[PDB]
């Protein structure tokens, strides 16, 4: 596993954004072979989305042939509601890049048949073959996507009931009223994520310190689904300073020297 | 993973039995496509077997096209010995249902060539393709089937030497004399179980509290093979009240509300 | 998992060597179907290599049709340097057996293109199909091959940066000067090892007690890659007396009686 | 140890206030034998102070013969700053009850001689003999008073350097600017609290869930100073619902049966 | 801490009895300076009482000048009920030795004033000065006396509410009906036991394996009150084979070398 | 607890020596009130003794009025053997400073009456009142003095049987032959060290990394006797870089900010 010990969130977004750009450009997407990108929502990727937009405007990357798939979406929340993941994605990303509407894949949290929705989503990923790079975040309780503690490490896209603690964390976007945040959400499973060619998790803040420790130093278990990365052949964790506070000295020492050159880019 | 927090063993058997019935009926087994069912022995499934028999007598299910495979069988114990798993199954189940003798698959604990026996068993499962629902229990030390601590999480059907503690637990059926219980037994491996489409573990009693905690809150490891369910995409654990005593408040809180409707059937 | 509790290193080598011999002879290798053997370097296998050489000289085994693959090799160290794994293997083994030069596969730690080297190595294993028996050791920090803590449990052959602690341990062969030991090394991944038909780990000494405990009693995690054996269907650990000091009484009791006959050969 | 499991902060405040009132009234304090109350500051005790004031105005208690000692104070914060513990204690309690000015004891965070201030504080406690009841809170990191992780369990009143997490936690009262929160504070040591006849800690909110678990279910250690209560012959922990989430079901169950009557004021 | 590793309960009884006899005889008690023996009830001490009686009848000890104090008694159980600790102590020991009626001390579980009964009990111990040897057992949950999980490590004689597991465990003596086992009991606290000159705990059976491990290898904590012995300058634990199963090989090894001579009475 | 995080053993020696010198000079010892220094042997204190001698020769301290008490001594080792602690203390310290022969206190490992030797040793400490500063080291297994795992935390000076790991560790000084290392030794108990006004432990090398972690981050337990310092009101641990590797980043961070000024002698 690769862990990139950075200091600031701004640095994390810059690093993470440059990485996505390098992968796309190295891949050389065409209409027949698009680059499939997995994407998250929340506060963590904000700097990354900003960096990417900056790079696109500078003519450094084009998304004309990039296909995207988002990790999840709230159930029952209106599409046009400012806090739906659909709104989030467009406001913060799509509205500023040249990605065509065909290439955008979001889970329909208002599908008449929830079960058909999840099944079709998996089918969509399969049709393109494989997600090349899946970017995401980690929850306070260690959940990846919305695979809350006790989710199967082999799970597929399905409807999931959120842990009260997650709703409380997410209530920031709902005027701090827990009663506002949806009790359920459609999410890609751990198995889905594991099928991706490369997984890149952004970790920012002290609230994620126990989660990061669980992912790096812990054992594989379904209570902290983020630990599934230990079984992934190409996992990367980009973190800032405060999120590494629960790690051992030797753990952070090892990674710091591995990435020494890799992060001096500034 | 789904955990059904129930109060009484009677409730567990009722829930578990109704689930098996719903799956079979929803499947609609025919002579060409039978429903393959995995089954355990011991004290835990007693209420389930009783419920099933009740439902069959009421004309709610028929086993005329259900194929069964049992988890294990003692080595060296005579078939007709009242405590052989062969005797157990017929006395407690088969003797009361309309399952034809062809559809019954039990491990021969007295096979001249133990190695050929296990290999043929695996072959038998393969010929039908896949076990649809595998029901089982959990040992005090967390063993699933007779996969004692240190059994490979990728293991196949083989001969296994029982842990002294297991023999002591099983001595209840041998007039409480440990010297009576067989030292070895043929058992399906963790890999075998994992190949099943759905796994349903019944957990009853305080003796299983540490085991249940290990399965739900613990990490995957071969010392408590029951933890292999964390890697299974369709695992269900039906428990009574005393078995949930080692869980965290939040863990039992989460599941109780998930199953709230699902268990109100009474 | 099988654990062979032995007393002395001499006993370990004897047991381990006899096992390799039995497997080869039972396999009956020919030019078209060779027996593929995985091999380690270090101090642990010394008695095993000696035993094997003794057995070959006695006409008990021939390596004329055995193909070998070594776990790793230092990067940047000259081939002819007495402490390169290439030198180690020939001095301690190849120089005394009848294995033809074609059948010897070692990682080129001085390849102009490191990435091509690792890829070709994997290809080499694939061409023969599958490694039949992979013998190895365990590091103080639990690393198998040079898959240091935090290596992916699904990893493939690649270049790896060694943990300072490993270099310190390996400095014994470099006149006790840490500055002498290479900072990097080419190594087969955990995924590579897992693809082998049977894995046999030799464990000798008190320095490996925490590692052995992690492998046998611990949970699967990438910090102690040796724990990957829990997911392997055919893993064997041969140990001496001092390495079992961190195990539980019951754990060593169980294995001692399982192998009672199996080790009385003396 | 007693743990009063209530649901809301309002209840915790009523139980706390009620318990203090009963101790005082049962004590029948006089000028020659006053009751000695140790007190905390922070968000936790807010409901308890409100209830105490109420009961006082209602003629249920008189602090005419009660001497108070506060746990801590910030170093270098002006005594008139609305956020100094001195201000907190007057604004929220002293300004509303009938306690003599000479009966109030507070650590002076602006003392020219810090060691002298602290020593004289312990000596002022000694002159009275002992603190009959010491009320307190618990920090996110499990700190009792400002005895941060790694504080001696036999510590006395001395100055302490506040952990970054505590400063961030306390920034709440300094308009969310950590830079405004004092870096140091004078606090009573663990040994000083252990010398009280009875200790009562108030735990509210999910943020203290880990602290509560460490206190109740953990072992004695100086990283979570709240663990010192396990050594106290008379410790009570009053908690709301969210703070008990990290506890085992059995643990909560026990305390629920235990305090059934004692918590039904209604 | 000394741990006497024996094989059988019979041996444990002989070592225990022998050790008590040697202390008394070495003490040379007189009416003006009696020996003070603290004693337990339950299945564990049965072999020790048998051996004590024997040695007495054989003229090896005289309890003429020995004062006894028992650890606990059930609240609300008739003194004449065959299962009251009073009955147990007479049936199994007092009725067979030469100890004066005035030298026997037992807690009255039917005392109208429970706090008074308990206080006077501590005062009766104080009048004699100190308990020279306090013999005891250990509960499945690690309880010493009836100091259930979460009992203060500095606790005194007081009433305690018995854990459901203890009641279920003790149902053995109430014809397996938990409803017949008293819900409360008067017991000496942890601090009271810590005040004895020497403490000797008897551990028998695999059911105590976890309690023994917590005692010997765990940390000091109030959930497993037997951990208080780590704080005692003179504690001995006499155990049989099954009770040591959860211990590390090294731990058992150490004690075996340590007590070699001391356990070879033969 | 204070932890001085330095980089090298040379620095640790300078900080240690400097701290001892300041205590003595600040104490202003006289013949009627001498300073009492407790001292250790082994490789760890080598740099501290060198620096003490230096400072002495430089006229910075006088041991004319300093009484010394050493922690331990080997049983059955000739007082003139170059490896006896007596020899160590003279060769490395006494032979170079101005301390009176009557001010030196050492345990006699060849005492005909071991209990008497040990008792009189505690009595000699009592006559002086108390040890003002007790300097020590830590064993790989976390032992303070020779209080091996499972030693009472309230232990006094007595004889102890050395753990095999300690003997192997100490073989360094007996030309690597464990058979030459004494099996027993007289040592001050945990309670004796806890009675010192201040304790200062020296930790050097990666081999002590686990001992340091147990001491700083672990819980109080008798398997790692160094954990007793958590109970000491005045304990300091001086460490080099390698010994801190098992600590959490946050833990090291805290101590670094804490000791910044205090470690910059330069
Ligand atoms: N909503 C999910 C991502 O789409 C989830 O994994 C999320 O990243 C996690 O809850 C962290 O959220 P944050 O970025 O707002 O901290
Ligand atoms: N015998 C096995 C099931 O066939 C085993 O898994 C069994 O379920 C387990 O030992 C639990 O037994 P119990 O149901 O008697 O408690
Ligand atoms: N060098 C590797 C084997 O090729 C590594 O796994 C090695 O076995 C391990 O470091 C143990 O070394 P040792 O045998 O020298 O103890
Ligand atoms: N500041 C101390 C109380 O005086 C401390 O114990 C406090 O209770 C703790 O930091 C928690 O603060 P809170 O009450 O604001 O949660
Ligand atoms: N009842 C107490 C002894 O008087 C308790 O310590 C007892 O030893 C423990 O409950 C174990 O009971 P057992 O001796 O019946 O196993
Ligand atoms: N022998 C004792 C010191 O007198 C012991 O505390 C010692 O410090 C410990 O065994 C470590 O030895 P070392 O100093 O040689 O590392």
Flag whether D touches C (3+ CB pairs, 8 A cutoff).
Answer: no
Distance CA(A50)–CA(C205), nearest Å, equals 54
Ligand nearest, relative to CA of residue C163: 3
Domain extent, residue A53, equals: 1-266
Q: Are C164 and C48 in contact, with CB atoms under 8 Å apart? A: no
From residue E235, give the alpha-carbon distance in Å to each of A167, C57, E134, F115: 51, 59, 10, 18
Both tokens of residue D60?
A: 């249920």
From residue A210, give the alpha-carbon distance in Å to each of A141, A207, D168: 8, 7, 17
Q: Are C97 and C56 in contact, with CB atoms under 8 Å apart? A: yes
Are the Cβ atoms of F233 and D151 closer than 8 angstroms? Answer: no
Alpha helices per DSSP H over A164-265:
164-170, 190-194, 209-216, 249-263
Q: How far is the CA of C139 from the centre of ligand 3 (A)?
A: 6
Phi and psi angles of residue F200, each rounded to the nearest 5 degrees, phi first? -135, 115
Distance CA(D136)–CA(D152), nearest Å, equals 18
Are the Cβ atoms of C248 and E248 closer than 8 angstroms? Answer: yes
Q: Can you tell me which residue has the tokens 């939040």?
A: B250
Phi and psi angles of residue F37, each rounded to the nearest 5 degrees, phi first? -105, 125
Q: Are F37 and F133 in contact, with CB atoms under 8 Å apart? A: yes
Q: Are A220 and A230 in contact, with CB atoms under 8 Å apart? A: yes
Q: Is D141 a catalytic residue?
A: yes
From residue F128, give the alpha-carbon distance in Å to each of E16, F37, F123, F124, F200: 40, 11, 9, 7, 20
Distance CA(F49)–CA(F92), nearest Å, equals 7
Q: Is E215 on the interface with F (CB under 8 A)?
A: no
Domain count, chain D: 1
Provide the CB-side half-sphere exposure for B7 (13 A, CA).
4
Non-local CB neighbours of C75 within 8 Å, separated by 6+ positions: C109, C110, C114, C159, C182, C183, C184, C185, C186
Distance CA(C40)–CA(C143), nearest Å, equals 13
Q: Is C206 on the interface with F (CB under 8 A)?
A: yes
CATH code at position A51: 3.40.50.1360
From residue D75, give the alpha-carbon distance in Å to each of B122, B158, D160, D181, F232: 73, 70, 9, 10, 25
E252 three-class SS: helix
- Give E35's strand partners: E66
- Compute, in degrees rounded to 10, the torsion defined by CA atoms E142, E145, E151, E154: -120
Q: Following DSSP, what letter does each residue of B174-208 receive, concatenated?
A: GTT-GGGS-SEEEE--HHHHHTSSEEEEEE-SSTT
Beta strands F235-239 and F2-5, pairing class? parallel
B168 chain-E contacts, CB cut-off 8 A: 206
Pairs across A and C, CB distance < 8 A:
48
Q: Hey, how many other C-beta atoms are within 10 angstroms of the C-beta on F145?
A: 29
Provide the CB-side half-sphere exposure for D247 (13 A, CA).
27
Burial of C262 (0-12, 13-18, 19+ CB in 10 A): exposed
Distance CA(E63)–CA(E27), nearest Å, equals 12
Experimental method: X-ray
Distance CA(C239)–CA(C9), nearest Å, equals 8
Any ligand 1 atom below 6 A from CB of A225: no
B219 chain-A contacts, CB cut-off 8 A: 218-221
Any ligand 3 atom below 6 A from CB of C136: yes
Q: Is A98 a catalytic residue?
A: no
Q: Are F105 and F121 in contact, with CB atoms under 8 Å apart? A: yes
Distance CA(D192)–CA(D194), nearest Å, equals 5
- Give D68's strand partners: D37, D104
Distance CA(C111)–CA(C77), nearest Å, equals 11
Distance CA(F30)–CA(D170), nearest Å, equals 49
Distance CA(E159)–CA(E181), nearest Å, equals 16
Both tokens of residue B20?
A: 């098996």
Q: Are C220 and C228 in contact, with CB atoms under 8 Å apart? A: yes
Q: How far is the CA of B140 from the centre of ligand 2 (A)?
A: 9
Distance CA(E237)–CA(E19), nearest Å, equals 12
Phi and psi angles of residue A38, each rounded to the nearest 5 degrees, phi first? -95, 140
Are the Cβ atoms of C253 and E245 closer than 8 angstroms? Answer: yes
**Among residues F190, F191, F260, F247, which one has the least CA distance to residue F215?**
F247
Distance CA(F15)–CA(F11), nearest Å, equals 6
**Among F1, F219, F221, beta carbon nearest to D152:** F1
- Sheet of strand A72-74, all strands in order from the earlier edge strand to the far edge: A72-74, A184-187, A158-161
Both tokens of residue D21?
A: 């009132």
- Locate the chain F residue with the closest alpha carbon to C165: F206
Q: Can you tell me which residue has the tokens 């219980």?
A: B181
Does an H or E element contain F215, and which? helix F209-216
Both tokens of residue D79?
A: 């005594």
From residue D33, give the alpha-carbon distance in Å to each of D38, D127, D128, E239: 16, 12, 8, 52
CB-based contacts of B124-128 (< 8 A; 24+ apart in sequence): B124/B69, B125/B36, B125/B69, B125/B192, B125/B195, B128/B34, B128/B36, B128/B67
Ligand nearest, relative to CA of residue C12: 3
- Compute, in degrees rounded to 10, the torsion defined by CA atoms A36, A42, A43, A47: 10
Does an H or E element contain B66, and which? strand B66-70
Distance CA(D35)–CA(D23), nearest Å, equals 9
Any ligand 1 atom below 6 A from CB of A38: no
Question: Resolution (in Å) of the shown entry?
Answer: 2.4
Any ligand 5 atom below 6 A from CB of E71: yes
Q: Which of C56, C65, C72, C73 is flagged as catalytic?
A: C72
Q: Are B7 and B241 in contact, with CB atoms under 8 Å apart? A: yes
**Among residues B232, E5, D123, which one has the least CA distance to residue A155?**
B232
Q: Can you tell me which residue has the tokens 């206080």?
A: E119
F91 three-class SS: helix
- Compute, in degrees rounded to 10, the torsion defined by CA atoms F96, F101, F105, F107: 90
The secondary structure of residue A147, as a DSSP letter, is B
Q: Are A238 and A12 in contact, with CB atoms under 8 Å apart? A: yes
State the greatest distance between any 2 C-alpha atoms of chain D, in Å, as a whole number: 52
Are the Cβ atoms of E221 and D230 closer than 8 angstroms? Answer: yes
**Among residues C56, C2, C65, which one has the least CA distance to residue C28?**
C65
Separate counts of helices (H) and strands (E) for chain D:
8, 10
Distance from CA of F246 to the nearest CA of C (A): 12
Protein residue whose Cα sits closest to atom 10 of ligand 3: C139
Flag whether F touches D (3+ CB pairs, 8 A cutoff).
Answer: yes
Q: Is D244 on the interface with B (CB under 8 A)?
A: yes
Distance CA(F266)–CA(F257), nearest Å, equals 17
- Cα-atom radius of gyration of chain E, to the nearest Å? 17
Buried b vs exposed e over D233-246: b needs ≥16 C-beta within 10 Å?
Answer: bbbbbbbbbbbbbb
Does an H or E element contain D201, and which? strand D199-203
Buried b vs exposed e over D10-26: b needs ≥16 C-beta within 10 Å?
Answer: ebbbbbbbbbbbebbee
Q: Is E232 on the interface with F (CB under 8 A)?
A: yes
Q: Are D162 and D146 in contact, with CB atoms under 8 Å apart? A: yes
Distance CA(C134)–CA(C71), nearest Å, equals 9
Non-local CB neighbours of B242 within 8 Å, separated by 6+ positions: B204, B205, B206, B209
Q: Are E165 and B206 in contact, with CB atoms under 8 Å apart? A: yes
Q: Is C143 a catalytic residue?
A: yes
A116 three-class SS: helix
Q: Following DSSP, what letter does each residue of F118-156 receive, concatenated?
A: HHHHHHHHHHH---SEEEE---TT--BTTB-TT--TT--
Q: Are C158 and C71 in contact, with CB atoms under 8 Å apart? A: no
């Amino acid at each position: 596993m690769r862990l990139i010990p950075l200091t600031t969130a701004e640095q994390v977004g810059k690093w993470a954004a440059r990485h996505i750009v390098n992968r796309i450009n190295a891949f050389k997407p065409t209409a027949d072979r698009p680059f499939v990108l997995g994407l998250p929502t929340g506060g963590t990727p904000m700097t990354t989305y900003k960096a990417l937009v900056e790079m696109h405007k500078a003519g450094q990357v084009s998304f004309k042939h990039v296909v995207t798939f988002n990790m999840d979406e709230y159930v029952g929340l209106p599409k046009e509601h400012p806090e739906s993941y659909y709104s989030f994605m467009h406001r913060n990303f799509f509205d500023h890049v040249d990605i065509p509407a065909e290439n955008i894949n979001l889970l329909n949290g208002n599908a008449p048949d929830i079960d058909a929705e999840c099944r079709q989503y998996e089918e969509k990923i399969r049709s393109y073959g494989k997600i090349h790079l899946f970017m995401g975040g980690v929850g306070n309780d260690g959940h990846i996507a919305f695979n809350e503690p006790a989710s199967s490490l082999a799970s597929r896209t399905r409807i999931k009931t959120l842990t009260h603690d997650t709703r409380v964390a997410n209530s920031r976007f709902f005027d701090n009223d827990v009663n506002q945040v949806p009790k359920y959400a459609l999410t890609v499973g751990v198995g889905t994520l594991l099928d991706a060619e490369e997984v890149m998790i952004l970790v920012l803040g002290s609230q994620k310190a126990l989660a990061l420790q669980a992912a790096v130093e812990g054992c594989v278990n379904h209570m902290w689904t983020i630990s599934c990365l230990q079984l992934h052949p190409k996992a990367i964790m980009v973190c800032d300073e405060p999120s590494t506070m629960e790690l051992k000295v030797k753990t952070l020492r090892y990674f710091n020297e591995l990435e020494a050159e890799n992060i001096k880019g500034l």
